[PDB]
Amino acid sequence: AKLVRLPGLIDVHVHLREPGGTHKEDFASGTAAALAGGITMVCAMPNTRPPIIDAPALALAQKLAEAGARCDFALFLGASSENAGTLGTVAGSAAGLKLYLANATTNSSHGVTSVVQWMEHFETWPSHLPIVAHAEEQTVAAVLMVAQLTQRSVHICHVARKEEILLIKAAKARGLPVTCEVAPHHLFLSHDDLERLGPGKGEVRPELGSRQDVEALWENMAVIDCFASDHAPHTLEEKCGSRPPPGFPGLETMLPLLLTAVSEGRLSLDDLLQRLHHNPRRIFHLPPQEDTYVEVDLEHEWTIPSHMPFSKAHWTPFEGQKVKGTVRRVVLRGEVAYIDGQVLVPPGYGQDVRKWPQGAVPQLPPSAPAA
Ligand SMILES: [Zn+2]
Ligand SMILES: [Zn+2]
C-alpha cells in the first residue's frame, strides 16, 4: 500500500476541556488524538472551566496548552454577557472570538442571551480578527444579519441541516462575506443511526439530521469552506447519564471517514485539502508549519472499534462503520510525531502559533486615516 503525502491538516473546532474538565480530555490527550488523526494544528474552544472569557483565563489556558500540547495550536476567546469591549488588548493573541448562540439554558452561552449582545461584540471586537458563531436553524440567518449591519465577515460553525446550508448558499450568491464548516458526524451519521446510538450517546448540538439533510450537505459541498471535527469529548458515563451533554469525539475518526469518501469518488483529494488545510488557513490567518506533513495509506480497509486509542472519551459514534485508509505517519516541524499506533512527541512540544511572527493577523497601523 503506497503512501500519499499531504500537508499538515488543521482542525479549527476542538473542545479540549482544560482547564477544569481534564477527566474528559486534556491538552496532552486531545493533541495526541489530533496527531493520530493527521491533524498538526488545532483551535481549542473557550467553554473551559474557568471559561476563556477574560485575559487571566486566556493566559492560564495558553500556558497549560504550551506545557501540554503535542501539536501546534491557537486558543479561542469566548463572548460573554460582560466582556464586550474588554478584550481589545489580548484579541490578537487568540484564534478568534467564539459566540455561543444555542437557544437553551447552558453556561456555554456565557450569558449571551440577546441579539443586542451579539451586535456589541461584532462592533467592539477588532474587525480584522475572526468571529465564529454556533448557530442552529434560524439563528444562522440572524447572525448573518448582525454581520451585515456591522459590515464584517462571520464564520458559521457545524452546519448540519438543508435549511442552513441553502441559506448560506443564498448569502454567498449575493456576495456576503460568510464562510462555514461542517462536521463529519453530520455527513456520515443520520436519523437512521439514532436507534443504534440511543438518545444518550446520540445527543449532539446541532443534532443529527435526516437523510435529506445529509443529502443536501453532499449536494452542496461547494458551499462548505471547512471540515472540522467539533471534537467534544465526554466520558461515556456522562453521555449515558441523567442530563447528557451534547458532543461527539471525532478527531481520530475524521480523516479515515473522509478518505473513505475520497476512495468512493464522493469528493476529490483536492476538495479535502481545500477544506482541511487551505481554507482553515486563510479564514483564521493561520501560519504554515515548516517541515510538516502527513503520510496516509489509502488501501488499508478496517472497521472503527468501540473506542479509539487516544481520546479519553473512550467511545465513538462511528463504531462498526467500515473505512478505507489510515494515517501512517505524521511529521511535525522536523520531528516524527506519530507512527502507526503511537504518538512520539511529548506533552509541551506544541506551540502557540499566534506567537510566531508569521502567525499574527496583519492589520493596518493605528495612525491610518478613517476610511
Ligand atoms: Zn458549537
Ligand atoms: Zn463546538
Curated annotation (Swiss-Prot):
Which residues bind (S)-dihydroorotate per the record?
17, 47, 205, 234, 246
Please describe the post-translational modifications of this protein.
Answer: Activated by MAP kinase (Erk1/2) phosphorylation just prior to the S phase of the cell cycle, when the demand for pyrimidine nucleotides is greatest, and down-regulated as the cells emerge from S phase by protein kinase A (PKA) phosphorylation.
Q: What's the effect of swapping residue 54 to N?
A: No change in catalytic activity
S-S bridge residues = none
* Induction per the UniProt record: Transcriptionally repressed following hypoxia by HIF1A.
| Positions contributing to Zn(2+) 3 binding | 98, 134, 158
What does the annotation give as the result of altering residue 134 to A?
Abolishes dihydroorotase activity
Spell out the residue ranges making up region: DHOase (dihydroorotase).
2-332
Q: Which residues carry this modification: N6-carboxylysine?
A: 98
The subcellular location is: Cytoplasm; Nucleus
**Residues engaged in binding Zn(2+) 2:** 13, 157, 181
Which residues constitute the catalytic centre? 230
Residues the record lists as binding Zn(2+) 1: 13, 15, 98, 230
The linked condition is: Developmental and epileptic encephalopathy 50: A form of epileptic encephalopathy, a heterogeneous group of severe early-onset epilepsies characterized by refractory seizures, neurodevelopmental impairment, and poor prognosis. Development is normal prior to seizure onset, after which cognitive and motor delays become apparent. DEE50 is an autosomal recessive, progressive disease with onset in infancy and favorable response to treatment with oral uridine.
Q: Which family does it belong to?
A: In the N-terminal section; belongs to the CarA family. In the 2nd section; belongs to the CarB family.
Its subunit composition reads: Homohexamer. Interacts with CIPC.
This chain's function reads: Multifunctional protein that encodes the first 3 enzymatic activities of the de novo pyrimidine pathway: carbamoylphosphate synthetase (CPSase; EC 6.3.5.5), aspartate transcarbamylase (ATCase; EC 2.1.3.2) and dihydroorotase (DHOase; EC 3.5.2.3). The CPSase-function is accomplished in 2 steps, by a glutamine-dependent amidotransferase activity (GATase) that binds and cleaves glutamine to produce ammonia, followed by an ammonium-dependent carbamoyl phosphate synthetase, which reacts with the ammonia, hydrogencarbonate and ATP to form carbamoyl phosphate.
Q: What else is known?
A: GATase (glutamine amidotransferase) and CPSase (carbamoyl phosphate synthase) form together the glutamine-dependent CPSase (GD-CPSase) (EC 6.3.5.5).
Please give the name of this protein.
Multifunctional protein CAD
Look up and give the organism this protein is from.
Homo sapiens
Q: Which residues of the full protein are shown?
A: 1460 to 1826 of 2225
